[PDB]
């Protein structure tokens, strides 16, 4: 059975976030899918540093 891992982090814009998601889905189809899944998350930038 698969074990979930959650790589994925800050990008620039929403289009870039969708492109990142499609890229990780492309990276799943090759080689393993029955041991590891590695779904990905995202979040966009903010001006204030401490908020980031």
């Amino acid at each position, epitope marked *: *059975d698969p074990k979930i891992v959650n790589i994925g982090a800050v990008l620039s814009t929403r289009k870039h976030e969708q492109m990142f998601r499609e890229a990780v*889905n492309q990276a*799943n*189809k090759r080689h393993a*899918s*029955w041991k590891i899944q590695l779904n990905a998350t995202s979040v966009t930038h903010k001006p204030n540093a401490i908020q980031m």
Partner: antibody
Amino acid sequence: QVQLVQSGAEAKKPGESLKISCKASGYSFTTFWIGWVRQMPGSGLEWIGIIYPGDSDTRYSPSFQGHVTISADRSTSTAYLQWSSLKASDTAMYYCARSAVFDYWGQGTLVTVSS
Amino acid sequence: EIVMTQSPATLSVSPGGRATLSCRASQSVSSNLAWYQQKPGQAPRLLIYGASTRATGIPVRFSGSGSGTEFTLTISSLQSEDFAVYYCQQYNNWPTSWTFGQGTKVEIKR
């Protein structure tokens, strides 16, 4: 929790074309290499096809290349299988895989073509 | 394009012995393999993938070994519930090949 309930059994007269439905549940349908496997009465196994149900990228087996009509709906998670013709002497039983190591299997669906 | 040879054709053991089967490799098929159990009138299951790792929910008796040359599993202390047909199958260039075998068969002794 994964279930791969197939369609009920059916037999047909020679010549016609048939459809087989392998419904899925419990997981994101558009992430795993669904396939099919054959079994003749009192014999071994053979591989039919496989279809990554994200972009319908199929890769048929050379044994039945260009003879079957594998496909996969994205909405209801019901990757089908359709016949064209010449299905006369092919009485057997068919299963649907899950993930290219066959972690989960379905049930019994028998196809019998006779006069 | 590779033919899997499965031997022996039909074994037989007493309820409490052991077993030792064989999937002869016509080539050096990397280190990828599988081993399937199937009882009459039922859908097979998964036992070992990669020839060395156990799938979750499989009792501890089943184990195997192999390095791309006639890998082998040994069911130790075969109980009553076991003894149905077996199968071996490889996966090296996927998706291209998906070649199965013929598999042995185990029957109780009396």
